[PDB]
Design a protein around this ligand. Structure first.
Ligand SMILES: *[C@@H]1O[C@H](CO)[C@@H](O[C@@H]2O[C@H](CO)[C@@H](O[C@@H]3O[C@H](CO)[C@@H](O)[C@H](O)[C@@H]3O)[C@H](O)[C@H]2NC(C)=O)[C@H](O)[C@H]1NC(C)=O
Ligand SMILES: *[C@@H]1O[C@H](CO)[C@@H](O[C@@H]2O[C@H](CO)[C@@H](O)[C@H](O)[C@H]2NC(C)=O)[C@H](O)[C@H]1NC(C)=O
Ligand SMILES: *[C@@H]1O[C@H](CO)[C@@H](O[C@@H]2O[C@H](CO)[C@@H](O)[C@H](O)[C@H]2NC(C)=O)[C@H](O)[C@H]1NC(C)=O
Ligand code: CL
Ligand code: CL
Ligand code: CL
Ligand code: CL
Lengths: 256, 126, 259
């Protein structure tokens, strides 16, 4: 036949593990959409129905962008009163939520609690990553790569080492990979052969956003490069960002 | 776990020889690349020498090139390390291993080497 | 006469097994139908019969060699051949029975079991749960020798079921999951015999529902959560596909994508 896609009422988590929120729970037309700590109740301001028409609705009102230029805030609005194609959104497999008319992307240009959501030019940054799920917490696993060794981070340096039962990693909804022991530090890469480090997630930049792919590689979306173990040499204690070929030094596996 | 038996080791005067035998009762060692690793008390695990499954290809590190001889007996499922002309830098804990990661032998003995031995102390002192 | 993929346990290494599971995945799908970056197995509805099965020849250190048959539609084992005998799982519908007629034509005589192939059957016959049947290269070597000798009357019925549980998990479930593949990949590495974790057990039980949950989702988000388990017996729920993209390698055809 043909797959019947449903309309699951769900939360939308994004930057810094924060949820999409309707400011103060007020639903008058034009009210701003913000970034709030995820709740554990049934308040309608954080539960979003992924409707069959590429709209995103909460308490009847639609998720709508104020304009089609970068920097305008995303608001709550009547679904019939708003502009016909200002209420439409696409949720991509790589975590990006995009308005397909402006081609701009739902983003939170700040990490603070209460940050007004905006539409921005798609750079595949952590500030532009989202995950529709009722799961409040990040997914803590151990990332295993070449030779069955574990991805370990100590201070800013990150390398690969034989697994010891730190090596735990919080896979956040915004696409950032963070060490479990310090959840405001991210798996960062500056340039787009460069070396990966553990800087703060403050910038929430393209280069701190990662995507686990089906081929076994951890892919940086903006650059197109994947995680690589320099010359398949774990003793170098260097994880770099190399173009794609698919050898074991590029293959990883989350072992939760 | 340990699945290789170790026989050998001890104290030696610099410039002397020594043999390190290593067999596997229940492990089929004749199929996989076998190698030797060592580690000084301070640091750190370094590789010594490996040998192809068919004994055709062998690799050695710099500190042992020309002085150590790795060999194997696939009829007896054993692996040996002949340590001639020993230097005081060879003082470490030597362990035999068998890589099950790669079908062939890699340069610099690259691999996982998940099946290892108990390991014995080698001491080159005057 | 279908595609033949061969793998041996004599000197089996992590790469020879990685190349084996990858070669099995290559002959299972066309590779074209991919949904949310996870491939989809061909549809059984309008599938020609010469495109229905693939064969897997298994040999070990001993001279014994055994060949399995896999259903392309779900990568599961439907039967096996050993020498001049062929044994098939009890099919679950009239159509599956006829498709079995076309597997091992050139045999002395073929037999069909009274039981199906799902785990609740094989665990009862073997007298062992999946949580206690160990997996690894060693177990796979013993499973091959046991499968061959059943044609000669050497293997008891419980052991035959136990051997099936090992072959299905290490091949079928491995072709379906990079997770289960990597879990078998680490057993081959350090040469160990471990039983599958609750993580592996749950992924096997949920594979049927995970295929359904992903194909008919709304832009990746599930209609209802699927419950999974960690390495420890800890239960968590999955609401979206992004986390399962590194976990699932193949899905069974449920429905067709929208135009
Ligand atoms: C994520 O969590 C939220 C709340 O914890 C879930 O929303 C709730 O979803 C259920 C099922 O869709 C709703 O209950 C059902 O209502 C229908 C009405 O047609 C009724 O026929 C059923 O018997 C059942 O009672 C419930 O009202 C709803 N709660 C709200 C909207 O506040 C949501 O489903 C969860 N998402 C997923 C993907 O599991
Ligand atoms: C994020 O995912 C979407 C998935 O559709 C990608 O956008 C499309 O990618 C396909 C290639 O598979 C192109 O043919 C389309 O032109 C793209 N755009 C649209 C609107 O479909 C997008 O490229 C992905 N981003 C990254 C960095 O992989
Ligand atoms: C697995 O083994 C079988 C038999 O050893 C292979 O079939 C042979 O393939 C070669 C091509 O390299 C042909 O020349 C032979 O005639 C085939 N023999 C047969 C069909 O009996 C089969 O291709 C192997 N599969 C893989 C994936 O390597
Ligand atoms: Cl239809
Ligand atoms: Cl609020
Ligand atoms: Cl809602
Ligand atoms: Cl509308």
């Amino acid at each position: 036949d043909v797959c019947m896609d449903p309309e699951p009422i769900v939360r939308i988590v994004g930057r810094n593990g924060l949820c999409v929120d309707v400011r103060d729970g007020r639903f008058h037309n034009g009210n701003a959409i913000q970034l709030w700590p995820c709740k554990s109740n049934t308040d309608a301001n954080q539960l979003w129905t992924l409707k069959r028409d590429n709209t995103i609705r909460s308490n009847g009102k639609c998720l709508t962008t104020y304009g089609y230029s970068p920097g305008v805030y995303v608001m709550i609005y009547d679904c019939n009163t708003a502009a016909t194609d200002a209420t439409r959104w696409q949720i991509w497999d790589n975590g990006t939520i995009i308005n397909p008319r402006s081609s701009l992307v739902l983003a939170a240009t700040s990490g603070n609690s209460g940050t007004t959501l905006t539409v921005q030019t798609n750079i595949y940054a952590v500030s532009q990553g989202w995950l529709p799920t009722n799961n409040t917490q990040p997914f803590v696993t151990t990332i295993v790569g070449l030779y069955g060794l574990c991805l370990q981070a100590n201070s800013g340096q990150v390398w690969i080492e034989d697994c010891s039962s730190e090596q735990q990693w919080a896979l956040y909804a915004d696409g950032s990979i963070r060490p479990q022991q310090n959840r405001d530090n991210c798996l960062t890469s500056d340039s787009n052969e460069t070396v990966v480090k553990i800087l703060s997630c403050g910038p929430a930049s393209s280069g701190q956003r990662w995507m686990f792919k089906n081929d076994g590689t951890i892919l940086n979306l903006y650059s197109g490069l994947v995680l690589d173990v320099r010359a398949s040499d774990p003793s170098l204690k260097q994880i770099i960002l190399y173009p794609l070929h698919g050898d074991p030094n590029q293959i990883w596996l989350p072992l939760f | 776990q340990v699945q290789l038996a170790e026989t050998g080791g001890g104290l030696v005067e610099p410039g002397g020889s020594l043999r390190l035998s290593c067999a596997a009762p229940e492990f089929r060692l004749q199929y996989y690349t076998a190698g030797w690793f060592r580690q000084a008390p301070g640091k750190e695990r370094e590789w010594v020498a490996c040998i192809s499954a068919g004994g055709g290809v062998t690799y050695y590190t710099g500190s042992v090139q020309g002085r150590f001889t790795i060999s194997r007996d696939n009829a007896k499922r054993t692996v040996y390390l002949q340590m001639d002309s020993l230097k005081p830098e060879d003082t470490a804990v030597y362990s035999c291993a068998a890589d099950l990661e790669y079908s062939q032998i890699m340069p610099s003995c690259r691999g996982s080497y998940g099946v290892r031995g108990q390991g014995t102390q080698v001491t080159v002192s005057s | 006469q279908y595609p033949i993929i061969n793998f041996t346990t004599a000197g089996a290494t992590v790469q020879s097994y990685t190349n084996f599971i990858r070669a099995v995945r290559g002959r299972l799908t066309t590779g074209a139908d991919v949904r949310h970056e996870i491939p989809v197995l061909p549809n059984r509805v309008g599938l020609p019969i010469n495109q229905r099965f693939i064969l897997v020849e298994l040999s070990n250190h001993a001279e014994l060699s055994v060949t399995l048959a896999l259903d392309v539609t779900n990568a599961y084992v439907v039967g096996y051949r050993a020498g001049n005998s062929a044994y098939f799982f009890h099919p679950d519908n009239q159509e599956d029975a006829e498709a079995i007629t076309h597997l091992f034509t050139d045999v002395q005589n073929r037999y069909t079991f009274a039981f199906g192939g799902n785990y609740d059957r094989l665990e009862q016959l073997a007298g062992n749960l999946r949580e206690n049947i160990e997996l690894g290269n060693g177990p796979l070597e013993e499973a091959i020798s046991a499968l061959y000798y059943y044609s000669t009357g050497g293997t008891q019925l419980p052991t035959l079921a136990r051997s099936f549980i090992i072959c299905i998990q290490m091949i079928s479930e491995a072709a379906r999951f990079q997770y289960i593949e990597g879990e078998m990949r680490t057993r081959i590495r350090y040469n160990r015999r471990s039983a599958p974790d609750p993580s592996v057990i749950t992924l096997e039980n949920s594979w049927g529902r995970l295929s359904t949950a992903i194909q008919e989702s709304n832009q990746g988000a599930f209609a209802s959560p699927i419950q999974l388990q960690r390495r420890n017996g800890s239960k968590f729920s999955v609401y979206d596909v992004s986390i399962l993209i590194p976990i699932i390698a193949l899905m069974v055809y449920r429905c067709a994508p929208p135009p």
